[PDB]
Amino acid sequence: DAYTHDGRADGPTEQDRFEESRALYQASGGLNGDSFRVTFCLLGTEVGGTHQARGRTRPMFVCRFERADDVAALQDALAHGTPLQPDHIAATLDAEATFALHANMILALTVAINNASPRTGRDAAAAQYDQGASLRSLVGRTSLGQRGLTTLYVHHEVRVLAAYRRAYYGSAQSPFWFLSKFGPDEKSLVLTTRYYLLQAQRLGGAGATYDLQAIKDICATYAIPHAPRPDTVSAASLTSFAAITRFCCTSQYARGAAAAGFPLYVERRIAADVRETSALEKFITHDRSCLRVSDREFITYIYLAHFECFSPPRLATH
Amino acid sequence: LDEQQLDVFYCHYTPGEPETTAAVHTQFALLKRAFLGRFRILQELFGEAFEVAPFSTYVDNVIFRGCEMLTGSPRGGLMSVALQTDNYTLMGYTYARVFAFADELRRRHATANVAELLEEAPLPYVVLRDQHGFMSVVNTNISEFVESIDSTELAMAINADYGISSKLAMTITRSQGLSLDKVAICFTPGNLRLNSAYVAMSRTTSSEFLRMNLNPLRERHERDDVISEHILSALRDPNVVIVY
Amino acid sequence: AEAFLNFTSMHGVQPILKRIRELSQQQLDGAQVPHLQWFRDVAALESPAGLPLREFPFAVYLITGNAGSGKSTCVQTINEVLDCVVTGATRIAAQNMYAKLSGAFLSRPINTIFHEFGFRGNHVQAQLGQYPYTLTSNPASLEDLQRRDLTYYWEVILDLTKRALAASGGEELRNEFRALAALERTLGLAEGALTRLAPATHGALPAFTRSNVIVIDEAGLLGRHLLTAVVYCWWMINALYHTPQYAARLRPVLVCVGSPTQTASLESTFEHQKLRCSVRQSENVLTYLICNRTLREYARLSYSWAIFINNKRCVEHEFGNLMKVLEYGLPITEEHMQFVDRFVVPENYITNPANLPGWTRLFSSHKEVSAYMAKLHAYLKVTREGEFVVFTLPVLTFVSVKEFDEYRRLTHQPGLTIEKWLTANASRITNYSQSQDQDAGHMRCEVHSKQQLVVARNDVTYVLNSQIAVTARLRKLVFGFSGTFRAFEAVLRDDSFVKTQGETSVEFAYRFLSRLIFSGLISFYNFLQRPGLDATQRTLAYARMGELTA
Amino acid sequence: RNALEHFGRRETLTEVLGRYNVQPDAGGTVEGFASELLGRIVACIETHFPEHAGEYQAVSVRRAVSKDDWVLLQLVPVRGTLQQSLSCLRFKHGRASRATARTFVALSVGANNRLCVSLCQQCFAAKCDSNRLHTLFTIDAGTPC
DNA sequence: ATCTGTT
Ligand SMILES: Cc1cccc(C)c1N(CC(=O)Nc1ccc(-c2ncon2)cc1)C(=O)C1CCS(=O)(=O)CC1
Ligand SMILES: [Zn+2]
């Protein structure tokens, strides 16, 4: 998901932001821009942050594409689905921003590895260091950059891998998991994936506290026009991510007005549904607390009121 | 029969033992390709008859005699744990010795006496086929009964069993944590409560698969409506959330 | 469709999430937070008669409903939106939740509530309810109810405290969180920057040290003494480690999900005089919260309560009206009794294995279940209308003779024939409750000298090709596959088989499947030997098979 | 009204009885149908309660209740059957007295607008209850639609 | 009458 920094105070009207986003998602596949700053994220939840809903993805590194060849490679990756080779990521990687994320992790891993019971009491002639001086020196001598991570990986690879596999829980899932959770429809597989995983937490509207089933239900009534494509994805190809990445990147729901108006529709639909649900619930609760009858009549009223509010025909009309 | 009667393909392919993940992945991918291709050719050659043909596959030599399985030595095959929400089918029993089950019995259970006595006279293992069709051998059930009298503890007895049960009949109490499909209830006239009938009547999805030996509503039953009044009075509370 | 069946549920669980999140963020005062010295005092105790009156803060949210409601579909939204710990009263409840949670987005392995507060295998034999307690208050306070529950559960409570404190290197304060906090202070970092990474670097810490919202499913099967055990163990494990949430002055929030009408708690005691087992009905966790006046006003249960009033497993009009009458305790009328007469049949009709084949017979006693089971097995032999072979398997119980002397010495009763002791304890030595529903033969006892044991053996009758359940956690080693070709193809195409296995035998699983695939060949021509198959097709298959082989 | 429009219309007892060429009015119209059905009732009683079978070899029918959705007829042992009254089918009381147990046939409408015939009993022994009607079994009479 | 925690 691509965006630009606002700068302005009052967030543009819904149509203004729709227009701004529609021109960013060019109708051919390539975003409009000369320089890009791409944060690569895996699944997982960050720790120590307080928000309405917990996070779904977690950044791992940051790259900047500004050169013509780098920008061309990124556009090819975003438009068709061709993988990015490690050379480009190593050349465009932003070290300062990348290693600010893996800053406290190195310290925690160093403390855990070095946490063997200390004594700091050898005394002798010149063998007496302070109780807290040992950890102070260890942290002072630890480089919170590529050096420290490289050393930890070289010497303690198993521990580092185990620790990193727990900060990014669920980061290793197969193509079938993605197809089943967010699919099987193309529109769902694209829009719901992008919203639930990436845009819901960044935008932080009223739809950031709705689960994946609710988001798929909302996407069901996003009944924008279709345009049959030649062929779809199939099994025996889900052993790799290449086929699904090509299928999703080259979709018509990934650019233009289709991809520019789903986040807006989510909020519109949620507000419209709540507008009716709240009023009906208020009516039901007011009548619930003042009805003076009997248990049989009270149960009759409860179920009759809920049927009158939410019988299948009324839900279909709504 | 014709000259080609034994699937000569074997005379040309020799799969060696596995190696590091790279070697293992290469072997599995090629074998899966070969297996599907033969399936495609035979399916193309015949069609549905090949699809529903009886089939089997085992790592070692296994012979099923009556209710028993005969095998040389069960070695290899991934270990796992049997679930409680799973449905299995009892295929038979076996006397083939498994080192993994025996060695752990030595490990987890500090009682070597039971380990040696069981080793001298071993008990058969139960062979189960899961829903998908994988034969499994399940370890025995050993429980240690330690009695606490005045905080004095003593593991006096051990019980070795199989730990399997059948859904053909149970008590009404054990059915309150279960979901059933067809239920036939046998109430006792006189030792009857209105809440035992509510629990037994609601184990199924439809009333077309429900039978009872008497009408619990027409007989003398015990009623305890203490919780029901609390639930009913919460439905009149403006602060309680009611969700349909 | 599937979009309007979740409309009423997805817009109504939002008020629930707002309250639960608000409850989980409330901060205590420094004087109310239980101190690590509280649990050191308990660990230095011999009888529960010296317990001081102390209060352990906590909060609750109730989510109740019938067994067909979507009250467990409300935990899939709490799990995806909130950071909580989902548990189960039993092992089946923990496995049903994982299927629902893992089948929606994702979930970690789900355990029982006994595994999370440290319940081990030696606590399954403790005798509960010995020491007497009297509530010295007409409107009993929380400290009075909490100390009553700590005295009933004293045998397990004392053991858990001793293991927790003793296992901490003795006096050595646990360094998992203290080491990072000291480094955090020295380096001048934001509070909680490093201490919240301890769970990742240390992968053996309990789940009670990572969150304060605890979700228990099927809380109606739990005794009322278990509300304090969870609250007393959450504070013990956080005070011991000094976790980031303990230092923030937060309290545990227990979200209790269950059905208060179709589920009950059971309490059983052993009398060593008549060698008798007594079972009575006790108060469960849900009834404790809803009925007790002190607990109901302390927890403000009128604001922390949600009721689900749907039933997805009832699409029949007249049957749904009978379930509503039974749940809410409405008067029974004559039109309800007329409706129920459809399902009545003679008792001899139900207790006849030849009738209603494949149905589950529900009895009230264990002797009736055993009596019918024997009849079924006998009928499955003689008639042979469909075969269904029946076989018997051996079972052995090894009774130690020195311990029996110790037990016999402590409680006299010299004779105490091992047969009579084993008969009386039949409901205790076993691991599962269905041991008494089995079809077993005559009981025989013998004495084995030298090794100094008493071995008792019996036989149990089973049916081949029948549907059984494994009522225990037993490891199984697979060695083959048995079915049709279409069944085999489906398993290999999807890697979900490998995923179900742990992330340590994937190479082993691939090797095992690779080994099975190689030996799974042949027999294609035995299938080709089917009567009247073909003449030219057989040769075409050979040529095609060779072509594919080449 | 909502239940009628949602779950569908249900047939009353009069229409179901008419489908069997029987009318609840006139008294004898339903007695004839009960007599035609009595063979199946007696066969079931013999099959499941063989001990209490001679009591139902010559039994006359007599109406007891004629509500809109429930009909209850009595089974009177004509005039000569050896045993004076009928005996309880559920328990074996202290022999001697027959523990007077009035026997009834109850007609109602079951699922799919079918006719349900149930056997009911009233026992005057304190153990059973008296003042209470007990259902022994229910059978289907929908074979002759 | 009567279940379940370990595993
Ligand atoms: C209430 C409702 C709302 C919307 C749509 C429908 C379909 C309904 N239902 C279905 C329903 O209530 N099912 C149910 C069955 C059992 C239990 C139960 N089990 C144990 O305890 N409770 C609880 C709910 C009705 O039945 C209406 C039908 C028309 S009406 O007559 O105007 C009101 C009831
Ligand atoms: Zn009687």
PDB file of N, CA and C and ligand atoms in Angstrom, chain D residues 88 91 93 123 125 128, ligand 2:
ATOM      1  N   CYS D  88     -50.991 -52.507  35.655  1.00  0.00           N
ATOM      2  CA  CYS D  88     -49.956 -51.553  35.286  1.00  0.00           C
ATOM      3  C   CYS D  88     -48.896 -52.220  34.418  1.00  0.00           C
ATOM      4  N   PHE D  91     -44.694 -51.322  36.176  1.00  0.00           N
ATOM      5  CA  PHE D  91     -44.152 -51.941  37.373  1.00  0.00           C
ATOM      6  C   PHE D  91     -44.979 -53.162  37.739  1.00  0.00           C
ATOM      7  N   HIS D  93     -46.418 -54.466  40.893  1.00  0.00           N
ATOM      8  CA  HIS D  93     -46.721 -54.117  42.273  1.00  0.00           C
ATOM      9  C   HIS D  93     -46.916 -55.401  43.081  1.00  0.00           C
ATOM     10  N   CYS D 123     -52.340 -45.300  36.844  1.00  0.00           N
ATOM     11  CA  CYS D 123     -52.223 -46.286  37.907  1.00  0.00           C
ATOM     12  C   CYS D 123     -52.543 -45.632  39.245  1.00  0.00           C
ATOM     13  N   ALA D 125     -51.757 -47.001  42.226  1.00  0.00           N
ATOM     14  CA  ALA D 125     -50.771 -47.320  43.249  1.00  0.00           C
ATOM     15  C   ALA D 125     -49.977 -46.075  43.617  1.00  0.00           C
ATOM     16  N   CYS D 128     -46.605 -45.543  41.642  1.00  0.00           N
ATOM     17  CA  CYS D 128     -46.725 -44.919  40.332  1.00  0.00           C
ATOM     18  C   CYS D 128     -47.086 -43.447  40.476  1.00  0.00           C
TER      19      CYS D 128
HETATM   20 ZN    ZN F   2     -48.457 -49.132  38.388  1.00  0.00          ZN
END
